Design a binder for this molecule. Structure first.
Ligand SMILES: *[C@@H]1O[C@H](CO)[C@@H](O[C@@H]2O[C@H](CO)[C@@H](O[C@@H]3O[C@H](CO[C@H]4O[C@H](CO)[C@@H](O)[C@H](O)[C@@H]4O)[C@@H](O)[C@H](O[C@H]4O[C@H](CO)[C@@H](O)[C@H](O)[C@@H]4O)[C@@H]3O)[C@H](O)[C@H]2NC(C)=O)[C@H](O)[C@H]1NC(C)=O
Ligand SMILES: CC(C)C[C@H](NC(=O)[C@@H](O)[C@H](N)Cc1ccccc1)C(=O)O
Ligand SMILES: *C1O[C@H](CO)[C@@H](O)[C@H](O)[C@H]1NC(C)=O
Ligand SMILES: *[C@@H]1O[C@H](CO)[C@@H](O)[C@H](O)[C@H]1NC(C)=O
Ligand SMILES: [Zn+2]
Length: 818
């Protein structure tokens, strides 16, 4: 008869200090433990409820003292993942007791809790390690505890191990003691007050490289012995970032050391474990044969994210999981603030707003986690730019200092910052409400009118925000603020302006629309002097215009006249906005009869980017986003028979066919070159042969693309059947080829006519196949093309939209083009 019926633990029995002894066998894959918890009762009681999961409790007793011990009855409630310890007599309030529990268990084979993980040496031998992953609720798998983040305590952790291994944990190793023949007991120092999910220990045979920060904090990277030489980058990144955070938060790194460990088969793939963060090997290790340029960038931000938690989230952790979004939101946001300073060469800035746009697009739906954590960061950025960067900085410092080693709620962050503007009430409009507002700007003389409304793709919501508006003016030279608390508000300028732009820097989590013809002046501004506003300002314009176009508040030509400025753009962010909203348009024309508009449109696009495309070096140099633009520009140009790039491309492909595939080819350009090369029936075949010795590389996927891009319909249809056969390739690729051909202007009918025919035997191999049903019909725009198609319930909608868009815009695009 279990004495507790709540998922949450009783609040009247409180842990103070854990003494953990874990003895794990990395051969038999089992572990025994003796954990002792010092507790205090605030109310009299003879039952102690706590957390346990998949642990066989051998023995539990209660100690007090001058010493006295007594057995505890043990009841399990596996559903709730809880135990109950029954005492003979009630506990004396305020008096310190100690619970001693003996238990045993099998190392997790599920990559959570205290789990087994493996790797193979270059010699090919298989090694075992034991590792931890507790967030959110897995500590109870390694040892019994009060497994809620509010129950903080100190931890004395002891690991028994073989001499061929080494244990690392949260705190530094104090002493190693030979305990028996093949047994050593590692004692690590007592932790500071922390939550269970942040406790961690690793048993393995890793190497390490170590550097010492300016403040004397020892930073080390542990990795598999064969790969330890790839930690040099992460280690340096860790050191400089730790130093950054110590300055920013104006609070010294709380712990004696910081250990970053690269874990085989890690599935998180990063964790904020206090003093011992863990990562997937690709997020920490770097080879001169890198997975990509993105990896360096990838690992420089994954680190920065986990290191930021050392302060925000560990030193001051949430009270409960409902605030996890703030923990994660802040770490994401901090990825940028830190790196932008620390590693400017990486150009992290671009990728931030991308995720903000991504978040918004999803919030704009009827329905409304990593993206929710992206909104958190976006929100924070908004707030940080409203209040000065320093007001923000100090407010955070105060938050950390006031709540160090304790727990927190959302309001606590707001309260702390609001004490340096009713931040709390404002922020809750953004936190307790799904979606974001569309903001319409109406000007009447010096009278500037603002209005807000819940922006969503029937339309009837009463949502209302406290929005931190910002704006610049053809006259002003400085950025203005205005707090929009109501449905509408006015604002009076000292004099009439030639143009006004809101959401400066694109730092705010909202889209703005200009009434009358503010767009006219803005697109007039961009075509005259586009540098008059920031790069991101230009990007937000392009982005908002084409969104407003898709909801019927802006006319397609107004947003196209806008893009005309792009002929002069040099910055990545805007160009990608342009491309992201323009391309899809002709991909709907491609799957339609009318070829004249399709061709004039493509002609228009290449005349816009002409200059930019020419400036492209045909190398692999530059930052991740610089390389992504080079890659996409060239591919585009050659796909649209822009002669200059097509010619060059042909040349390169010839030098590489007669190579044969021997001389190296820059990955940025290979996508275009292969594409061009696959156009000849002999080049297509060469690629297909070279397609096997592709080395399971990135190169394979590049060819796979080029092959599907040929205009030879027989060679396309051919790829279709063969990737369905067992002999040449089967399940691992067909789904992706089908969609790739479904996007070829001359190959879409085949993939459609194929999904229909072979449908029966096709379904024969239903959650990952939805990709194939979208990628085959996603871009139809005809009413009749619908009569045909009549899980993938979404694909039916998206076409409906494609048609509306066409019935409205096609006639405007046609006239525009002339
Ligand atoms: C996880 O669990 C394993 C068992 O599953 C523990 O492994 C045992 O560890 C002990 C201590 O390291 C090993 O003991 C050694 O046995 C030797 C004789 O071999 C016996 O066992 C082997 C292997 O099965 C048989 O082939 C052989 O026929 C025998 O039956 C002894 O010679 C060793 O002597 C040691 O003790 C003497 C006396 O004090 C000393 O003088 C020696 O110098 C030396 O210290 C030793 O007793 C035992 O063999 C291991 N098992 C196996 C199967 O090999 C792991 O220790 C444990 N590890 C962890 C990290 O938890
Ligand atoms: C966004 C990245 C830079 C960092 C990210 N990692 C994190 O956010 C970590 O701090 C998280 N601790 C990862 C996590 C969250 C929830 C449950 C288990 C593990 C990751 O992708 O691994
Ligand atoms: C051809 O080039 C490859 C490197 O791409 C090289 O490893 C190989 O040895 C070369 N073949 C020669 C030089 O005969
Ligand atoms: C570990 O698993 C085995 C079965 O593979 C089981 O018999 C054994 O009792 C388990 N050990 C525990 C639950 O402590
Ligand atoms: Zn995190």
């Amino acid at each position: 008869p279990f004495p507790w019926n709540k998922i949450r633990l009783p609040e009247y029995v409180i842990p103070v200090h854990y003494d953990l002894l874990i003895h794990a066998n990395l051969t038999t894959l089992t572990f025994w433990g003796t954990t002792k918890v010092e507790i205090t009762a605030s109310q009299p009681t003879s039952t102690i409820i706590l957390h346990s999961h998949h642990l066989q409790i051998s023995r539990a007793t209660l100690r007090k003292g001058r010493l006295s011990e007594e057995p505890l009855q043990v009841l399990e409630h596996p559903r709730q993942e809880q135990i109950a310890l029954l005492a003979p007599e009630p506990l004396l309030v305020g008096l310190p007791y100690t619970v001693v529990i003996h238990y045993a268990g099998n190392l997790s084979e599920t990559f959570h809790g205290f789990y087994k993980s493996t790797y193979r040496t270059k010699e090919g031998e298989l090694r075992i390690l034991a590792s931890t992953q507790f967030e959110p609720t897995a500590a109870r798998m390694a040892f019994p505890c009060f497994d809620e983040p509010a129950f903080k305590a100190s931890f004395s952790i002891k690991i028994r191990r073989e001499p061929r291994h080494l244990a690392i944990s949260n705190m530094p190793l104090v002493k190693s003691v030979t305990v028996a023949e093949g047994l050593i007991e590692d004692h690590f120092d007592v932790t500071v007050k922390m939550s269970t999910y942040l406790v961690a220990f690793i048993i393995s045979d890793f190497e390490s490289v170590s550097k010492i920060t300016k403040s004397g904090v020892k930073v080390s990277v542990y990795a598999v012995p064969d790969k330890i030489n790839q930690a040099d980058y992460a280690l340096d990144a860790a050191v400089t970032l730790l130093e950054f955070y110590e300055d920013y938060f104006s609070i010294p790194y709380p712990l004696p050391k910081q250990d970053l460990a690269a874990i085989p088969d890690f599935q998180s793939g990063a964790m904020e474990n206090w003093g011992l963060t863990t990562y997937r090997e690709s997020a920490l290790l770097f080879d001169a044969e890198k997975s990509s340029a993105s990896s360096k960038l990838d690992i420089t931000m994954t680190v920065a994210h986990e290191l930021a938690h050392q302060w925000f989230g560990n030193l001051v952790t949430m009270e409960w999981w409902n605030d996890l979004w703030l923990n994660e939101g802040f770490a994401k946001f901090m990825e940028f603030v830190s790196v932008s300073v620390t590693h400017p060469e990486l150009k992290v800035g671009d990728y931030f707003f991308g995720k903000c746009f991504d978040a918004m697009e999803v919030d704009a739906l009827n329905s409304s986690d990593d993206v929710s954590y992206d909104k958190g960061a976006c929100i924070l950025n908004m707030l940080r730019e409203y209040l000065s960067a320093d007001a923000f900085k100090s407010g955070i410092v105060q938050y950390l200092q006031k709540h160090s080693y304790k727990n927190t709620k959302n309001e606590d962050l707001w309260d702390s910052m609001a004490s340096i503007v009713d931040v709390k009430t404002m922020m809750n409009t953004w936190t307790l409400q799904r979606g974001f507002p569309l903001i319409t700007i109406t000007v009447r003389g010096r009278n500037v009118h603002m209005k807000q409304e819940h922006y969503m793709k029937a339309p009837d919501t009463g949502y209302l925000w406290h929005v931190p508006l910002t704006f610049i003016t053809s006259k002003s030279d400085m950025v203005h603020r205005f707090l929009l608390k109501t449905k509408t508000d006015v604002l009076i300028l000292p004099e009439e302006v030639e143009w006004i732009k809101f959401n400066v820097g694109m730092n705010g989590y909202y889209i703005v629309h200009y009434e009358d013809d503010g767009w006219d002046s803005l697109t007039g501004l961009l075509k005259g002097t586009h540098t008059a506003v920031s790069s991101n300002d230009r990007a937000s314009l392009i982005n908002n215009a084409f969104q407003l176009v898709s909801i019927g508040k802006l006319s397609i030509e107004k947003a196209l006249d806008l893009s005309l400025y792009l002929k002069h753009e040099t910055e990545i962010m805007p160009v990608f906005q342009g491309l992201n909203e323009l391309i899809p348009m002709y991909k709907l024309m491609e799957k339609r009869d009318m070829n004249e508009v399709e061709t004039q449109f493509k002609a228009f696009l290449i005349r816009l980017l002409r200059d930019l495309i020419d400036k492209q070096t045909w190398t692999d140099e530059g930052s991740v986003s610089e390389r992504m633009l080079r890659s996409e520009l060239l591919l585009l140009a050659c796909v649209h028979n822009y002669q200059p790039c097509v010619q060059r491309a042909e040349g390169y492909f010839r030098k590489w066919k007669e190579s044969n595939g021997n001389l190296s080819l820059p990955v940025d350009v290979t996508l275009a070159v292969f594409a061009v090369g696959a156009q000849s029936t002999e080049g297509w075949d060469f690629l297909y042969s070279k397609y096997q010795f592709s080395l399971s590389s990135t190169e394979k996927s590049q060819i796979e693309f080029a092959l599907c891009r040929t205009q030879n319909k027989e060679k396309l249809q051919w790829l279709l059947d063969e990737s369905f056969k067992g002999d040449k390739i089967k399940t691992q690729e067909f789904p992706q080829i089908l969609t790739l051909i479904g996007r070829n202007p001359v190959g879409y009918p085949l993939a459609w006519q194929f999904l229909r025919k072979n449908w029966n035997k096709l379904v024969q191999k239903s959650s990952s196949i939805a990709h194939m049903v979208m990628g085959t019909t996603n871009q139809f725009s005809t009413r009749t093309r619908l009569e045909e198609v009549k899980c993938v319930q979404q694909t039916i909608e998206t076409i409906e939209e494609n048609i509306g868009w066409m019935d409205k815009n096609f006639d405007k695009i046609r006239v525009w083009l002339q």
